[PDB]
Design a binder for this molecule. Structure first.
Ligand SMILES: O=C(O)[C@H]1O[C@H](O[C@@H]2[C@H](O)[C@@H](O)[C@@H](O[C@@H]3[C@H](O)[C@@H](O)[C@@H](O[C@@H]4[C@H](O)[C@@H](O)[C@@H](O[C@@H]5[C@H](O)[C@@H](O)[C@@H](O)O[C@@H]5C(=O)O)O[C@@H]4C(=O)O)O[C@@H]3C(=O)O)O[C@@H]2C(=O)O)[C@H](O)[C@@H](O)[C@H]1O
Ligand SMILES: CCCCCCCCOCCOCCOCCOCCO
Ligand SMILES: CCCCCCCCOCCOCCOCCOCCO
Ligand SMILES: CCCCCCCC
Ligand SMILES: CCCCCCCC
Ligand SMILES: CCCCCCCC
Ligand SMILES: CCCCCCCC
Length: 171
């Protein structure tokens, strides 16, 4: 089980607390409380299964619902992942959204170095139906077996988005 707090700012601010767990059988579940000001709030829940074909490739179908003051939306997904080495993995996710319509396509490259550091590149395309492009860089550090602080800097277009957070892992 892990508890992840994150603070986000652009250019008011957003906060989240994400609680999740991945079972050894590949089933996973998470719940996220979110709050923001420029005031708003919301709750997202996610269920998924990682099916691994082997040590290189896996697929992850997912289901999510969000309920909040601003909006609600349903966002199922399918993430493929390829571990090209022990230290290097790539993934691609298709995630439609239906909100009170469109999809995102998200590519990730994650590289672990010096045991405890991971640098991630993320490229995300969002297209509505009735483009935005994100370039995001994440650096995280496994401080000890329980704590992993991290920072991310991304562009959205023009505007810069900053995140700092920490993940707590239970043992
Ligand atoms: O229209 C709206 O409702 C909003 O649109 C905007 O939001 C963006 C984005 O478009 C949303 O999809 C969303 O992002 C997702 C999460 O909320 C966010 O914390 C983050 O997720 C991480 C991780 O990057 C992601 O890959 C995934 O992790 C999987 C899996 O779910 C986990 O269980 C675990 O197995 O690890 C996996 C992994 O590492 O890949 O979920 C993570 C998590 O924290 O749960 O990205 C998600 C995503 O990209 O889909 O919110 C964004 C936001 O900025 O809020 C817009 O910004 C907003 O204003 C609304 O209008
Ligand atoms: C393998 C499945 C393990 C699931 C364990 C987590 C379930 C523990 O119960 C928590 C339920 O909490 C309900 C909170 O109430 C909020 C109201 O909305 C809930 C609608 O589902
Ligand atoms: C055989 C294993 C399958 C692995 C699953 C990978 C995830 C599925 O990807 C779906 C591809 O959808 C791409 C849609 O692209 C639309 C056009 O691109 C956006 C430009 O406007
Ligand atoms: C297992 C910890 C995640 C909490 C999920 C709650 C689902 C309603
Ligand atoms: C009670 C929240 C969980 C709903 C999604 C679970 C689908 C398996
Ligand atoms: C609603 C279950 C998830 C479906 C995943 C395939 C479409 C993204
Ligand atoms: C401020 C860090 C949030 C996670 C800590 C979990 C407390 C048991």
């Amino acid at each position: 089980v892990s508890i992840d707090y994150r603070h986000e700012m652009q250019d008011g601010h957003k906060d989240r607390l994400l609680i999740s767990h991945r079972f050894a059988n590949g089933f996973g579940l998470s719940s996220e409380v979110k709050w923001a000001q420029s005031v708003s709030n919301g709750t997202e829940v996610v269920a998924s299964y990682v099916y691994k074909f082997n040590s290189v490739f896996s697929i992850e179908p997912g289901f999510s619902l969000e309920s909040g003051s601003s909006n609600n939306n349903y966002r199922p997904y399918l993430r493929g992942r390829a571990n090209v080495t022990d230290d290097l993995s790539v993934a691609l996710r298709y995630r439609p959204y239906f909100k009170r319509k469109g999809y995102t396509l998200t590519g990730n490259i994650d590289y672990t170095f010096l045991k405890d550091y991971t640098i991630g590149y993320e490229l995300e395309y969002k297209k509505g139906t009735s483009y935005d492009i994100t370039h995001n860089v994440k650096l995280s550090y496994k401080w000890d077996k329980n704590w992993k602080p991290y920072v991310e800097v991304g562009n959205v277009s023009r505007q810069t988005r900053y995140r700092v957070g920490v993940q707590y892992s239970f043992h």
